[PDB]
């Protein structure tokens, strides 16, 4: 019943998580100077819609055509999901052996790879 807090702990202590980056403007400003492969941040969906079934975390990264983001959700029992932001349908993500950040890193960087190869 408390596994959500352990998943949040794993995300929020990681250096990729940027607690002071909230708006789209701040994301653009961040990647103006940063060479980081991706960031994690507090998603807009937390204050936006739904009625408290997930805690929402967004990833952001930059390719040659601009900034791309991915929305993730954690449910009350600690399960991870990728979230389609246009339909809000969820898709479960199984945690890789080395843990949650190891999982998100693979989901984000492989997705960035698909984007870059299509450009």
């Amino acid at each position: 019943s408390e596994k959500i807090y352990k998943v949040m702990e794993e995300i929020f202590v990681d250096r990729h998580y940027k607690e002071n980056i909230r708006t789209g403007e701040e994301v653009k400003q961040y990647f103006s100077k940063s060479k980081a492969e991706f960031i994690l941040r507090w998603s807009s969906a937390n204050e936006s819609d739904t009625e408290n079934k997930y805690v929402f975390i967004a990833a952001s990264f930059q390719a040659s055509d601009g900034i791309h983001s991915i929305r993730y959700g954690i449910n009350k029992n600690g399960e991870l999901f990728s979230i389609n932001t246009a339909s809000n349908k969820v898709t479960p993500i199984d945690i890789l052996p080395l843990g949650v950040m190891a999982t998100l890193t693979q989901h984000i960087t492989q997705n960035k790879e698909l984007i870059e190869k299509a450009l």
Binding site: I67, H68, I70, N84, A86, K89, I115
Partner: peptide, 7 residues
């Protein structure tokens, strides 16, 4: 923000 959406 442009999001990566699958389904």
């Amino acid at each position: 923000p442009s999001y990566v959406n699958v389904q």
